[PDB]
Each structure stands twice: as structure tokens, then as C-alpha cells.
Amino acid sequence: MSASVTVLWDKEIEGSNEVVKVDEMVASNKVEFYLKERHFDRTITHNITLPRATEVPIGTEIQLEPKHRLNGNTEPITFTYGSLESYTELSEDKVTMPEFVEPKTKLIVILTRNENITSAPVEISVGDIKETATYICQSQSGINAEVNTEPL
Numbered sequence: 751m752s753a754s755v756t757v758l759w760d761k762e763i764e765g766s767n768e769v770v771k772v773d774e775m776v777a778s779n780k781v782e783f784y785l786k787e788r789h790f791d792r793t794i795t796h797n798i799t800l801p802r803a804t805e806v807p808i809g810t811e812i813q814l815e816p817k818h819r820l821n822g823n824t825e826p827i828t829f830t831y832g833s834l835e836s837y838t839e840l841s842e843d844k845v846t847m848p849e850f851v852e853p854k855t856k857l858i859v860i861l862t863r864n865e866n867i868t869s870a871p872v873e874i875s876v877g878d879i880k881e882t883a884t885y886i887c888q889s890q891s892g893i894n895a896e897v898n899t900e901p902l
Contacts, residue, residue: 751876752811757885758871759817765867766888772863772893778856778902783848788861788893790843794818795888798829798872799850805879808832812874818889829893845893858898864891 772790777783796816800806813826820841821869827837843863866889874881 751809753806753813753874753876754813755814756873757814758873762868762870763868765869767866768812768864769862772861773789773859774855774861775849775859775887779853780827780850783851783857785847788845790794790864790893791847791888792820792822792841792843792882792892793888794839794890795836796827796839797886797888798831799835799884799886800831800874800881801883804881806817806831806874806881807878810874810876812872812883814881816870818887822857843880847895848897853901854901856900856902858900860896860898861893862891862896865889 758832773783773788794801794816794889798812798814808831812829812831814829816827820839824838829835847859848857867886869884869886872883872885874883887893
């Protein structure tokens with residue numbers, strides 16, 4: 751009813767790897783800037799997938815410990831085959847804005863973050879049944895603010 755689990759971390763595959771533009775904000779001219787801080791949802795989705803013809807019985811628990819986590823969570827993720835095959839972590843990404851737009855100056859705030867997909871083999875055993883599943887991590891980094899100044 752409960753599997754022993756080993757992630758072949760050294761076999762990790764690097765899927766998508768992108769720096770994503772999240773937003774841009776512009777103002778022109780001292781005057782005070784629109785927001786002092788922006789707040790952003792940040793997620794990491796963890797997935798387990800099994801071969802279509804697997805012998806793993808429906809209901810089996812697969813407990814693994816991911817590499818990329820949020821909020822300093824350390825506890826294992828518990829997937830259940832055929833019920834709970836995905837799990838999403840949510841944290842609050844707080845980003846400080848520039849306070850002032852300076853005189854004779856147009857400022858541009860560029861907000862970016864990294865987003866990766868990685869996958870790895872998971873060796874699964876329930877009793878005499880062995881399987882190699884695939885673990886998939888959909889990750890987002892913290893946001894970076896680039897301040898760009900023009901004399902207009």
C-alpha cells in the first residue's frame with residue numbers, strides 16, 4: 751500500500767528554461783512613485799507520472815522529497831497513484847519599488863523571473879512490483895526588478 755521511492759536525481763532532464771518578463775511600469779518627470787511595493791504569487795508545481803500500462807496498484811502512496819521547495823518547507827510530498835498526482839506550492843513574492851522618479855527623468859521598471867521545467871526518474875517498489883515513474887517540477891524563481899533611467 752506504500753512504496754519505497756528513490757529519485758534518480760543525477761538523471762535529471764532540463765526541460766524549458768526561460769527568463770519571463772512579468773510586467774513593466776513607466777513614469778516620467780522629484781515626484782513620488784505609484785506603488786512602494788508589488789506583491790506576486792510564486793509557485794512550484796510537483797508532478798508524478800507513471801507508464802500507461804503500469805502494474806502499480808491504484809491507491810499506492812509515493813512519498814518523495816523534491817529539490818526545489820518554497821517557504822522553507824521540508825516535509826515530503828505525498829502523491830497517491832490515481833487520486834493526487836500533482837501538488838502546487840504557493841508563496842508571496844514581495845518586490846520593492848523605486849520611491850522617487852527623479853527630475854528630467856523617465857524611469858522604466860522591468861520585472862522578470864526564471865521559470866524552469868525539470869524531470870527525473872523515480873524508482874518505485876510496492877511488494878514485488880517495480881516501476882520507474884517520472885517526476886516533473888515546474889519552478890518559478892523570485893522576481894527581479896530592473897530600474898531603467900532615461901533623461902527622457
